[PDB]
Every structure is written in structure tokens, then in C-alpha cells.
Amino acid sequence: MKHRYSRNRLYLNPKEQELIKDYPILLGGAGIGSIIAECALRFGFENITIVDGDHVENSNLNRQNYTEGDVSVNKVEAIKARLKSINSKANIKIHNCFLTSDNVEEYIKGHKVAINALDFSSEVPLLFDEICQKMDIPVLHPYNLGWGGLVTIISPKGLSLNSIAKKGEKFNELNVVEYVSSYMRFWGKPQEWLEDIIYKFKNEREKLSPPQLSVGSWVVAGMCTHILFNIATQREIKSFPEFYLSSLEG
């Protein structure tokens, strides 16, 4: 293995390090995804495509991979600068574009795995998954539950997130999180912290974006890197409606 991956030994053999080096990852969303990209790059995944159309905002600094100097810059330009300072020989391809129903299929082509970190206020979070399923591309959905990291993998031949959507209202991250907490309580392991923050968020007078913490960003980035390593080396993983939830109490 290379001197950069020296301490990866025993956990990974030389042939696995080689395999994940060129494994093409598609990253939709450079918010929580900017933390995921660094952890995955340092692990050894050197072929990452990042698509995001937002700019770096002040409020990102509590949980995303940007600096004071990055504010007002395209997230994709900023995270590529960061990633290429970690690994100059890395293959980091960025696109400062929003995903739409018209362009999303062309971006997906050519990748072996995808990470759906798209805001539900755009238009294509679920269509993205539908297209990936058609192409044998498993999809990681990472969520920042503040204290917890949540990941579920949409597998090509399995259920989609549609199963938790009601046909009359739009579907966002609050539906996934309400699904997860309800699942946990039903099966005898309630996450009262998660139920508490769901309750607090719903009863807010003003309508704001969900809160997120650096802890959940860092934990979910670790989970994704492990899941990516498992998919690339064809080790077993749980697919939706199953999920991975990781927190200080677990």
C-alpha cells in the first residue's frame, strides 16, 4: 500500500485499497456530503464526482467542510480545493449545477454507487433514486440527526423511499426521521432524544430548515465510508426499509 495508506493495513489488504481507489462515487450534495467526501477520500476513495449548486453560507460552518474564506464561493469549488490539498493525485470532478429532471440521468451514468444528499426543496431527490435503481447503482441516504448519524441504502431491486411518502403531500427529511423514530419505538428500542427533537422542530412557530450538529455530520461521514467500503468489496449491507443509526448510546 502507499505511504499515505500505511496505517490502513490489516483492515484493508493491498488489493482492496487498489479497488476503492478508482471506484467511481457520485455525490449529490456538498453540504453534509463535504464531510463524507473527506473521510472517504482519506480512507482511499479517490474517484469522487460532486454535484451541488449552492454557495457556502455562514450557517454551514457548524457542520460542513468549509472555512471563513470559503463564504460566498461555490460549494463545489471550495470542497474540491479542500480535497485536492489532501490528495493532489486524486480524481475529484465537480459540477456547479442543480440536479433537475432533465439533467440528473446524465450525471448518474458512469458511477458504481451514489450518495443522495439532496435537499427535498429542489425537485429530484426521489427521481434521482428511481434512475439509480434502473442502472444497478445503490444509493446512500445520509441524514444528520444532530446527536445521531442515519444512513439507509436504496438498493436497485428493493423498496424505494416512496413507500414512506403519502401521495398527496410532498416528501422531505421529516418523513424519513419520523419513520425511523416510529420504527425504533415500535420494536422496543425508542430513541427519546430523536422523538424530542422531532417534537421541538414541528412545534416551531416560524418555518425554518432542520437543525443539524457537527457530531451527527462526523458520525454519518464515518458510517458512509464504511458502507462504501462494504459495497465496493461486495460485503453484506442492510437495504431500505432497513437502516443504520449510530449515536453516542450505540
Ligand X SMILES: CCCCCCCC(=O)N[C@@H](CCCCN)C(=O)O
Binding positions for AMP are 7, 52, 54, 63-64, 75, 99, 119, 122
Place of cell 427533537: 197
Restricted to residues 92-121, the positions that interact with ligand X (CB under 6 A) are 116-117, 119
Binding mask 64-103 for a second copy (x = CB under 8 A): ---xxx---------------xxxx---------------
Cβ neighbors of 29 (< 8 A, separation 6 or more) are 51, 52, 115, 116, 117, 118, 119
Any bridge partners for residue 154, and if so which?
Answer: 139
Query: Among residues 199 and 235, whose Cβ is nearest to ligand X?
Result: 199
Task: List the one residue from 146, 154, 161, 180 that touches a second copy (CB under 8 A).
Answer: 146
- Within positions 171 to 190, which residues make up the interface with ligand X, using CB under 6 A? 173-174, 177
Q: Which is nearer to ligand X, 91 or 98 (CB)?
A: 98
Minimum gap (Å) between residue 89 Cβ and ligand X:
25
Position 201 contacts ligand X (CB under 6 A) = yes
DSSP reduced 3-state for 77:
helix
Residue 243, binding choice from a second copy, ligand X, none, Cβ under 5 to 8 Å by partner class? none
By the 8 A CB rule, do 2 and 23 touch? Answer: no
How many Å is the Cα radius of gyration of the chain?
18
Of 117, 120, 114, 119, the residue nearest 155 (C-alpha): 114
Q: Which does 141 bind (CB under 5 to 8 A by kind): ligand X, a second copy, none?
A: ligand X
Q: Least distance to a second copy from the beta carbon of 131, Å?
A: 27
Q: How many Cα atoms are found within 13 Å in the side-chain-facing hemisphere of 94?
A: 21
- Residue 67 binds which one of a second copy, ligand X, none, with CB within 5 to 8 A depending on kind? a second copy
Strand order in the sheet with 47-51: 91-95, 47-51, 25-28, 113-116, 139-145, 148-154, 244-246
Joined together, the cell numbers standing for residue 209 give 430548515
Q: Select from 26, 27, 32, 99 the one that contacts ligand X (CB under 6 A).
A: 32
Q: For the chain, after which residues does the C atom lie more than 2.5 Å from the next written residue's N, i.e. where is it broken? A: none
Note whether 149 binds ligand X by CB under 6 A.
Answer: no
The whole-angstrom separation of Cα 133 and Cα 216 is 27
Asked if residue 87 lies in contact with residue 4, where contact means CB atoms within 8 angstroms, the answer is yes
- 142 interacts with a second copy by CB under 8 A: no
| Contact residue for a second copy among 35, 37, 139, 176 (CB under 8 A) | 35
In terms of CB distance, is 11 or 93 closer to a second copy? 11
Amino acid at 244: Y
Counting contacts by CB under 8 A, is residue 211 touching a second copy? yes
225 binds, among ligand X, a second copy, none (CB under 5 to 8 A by kind): a second copy
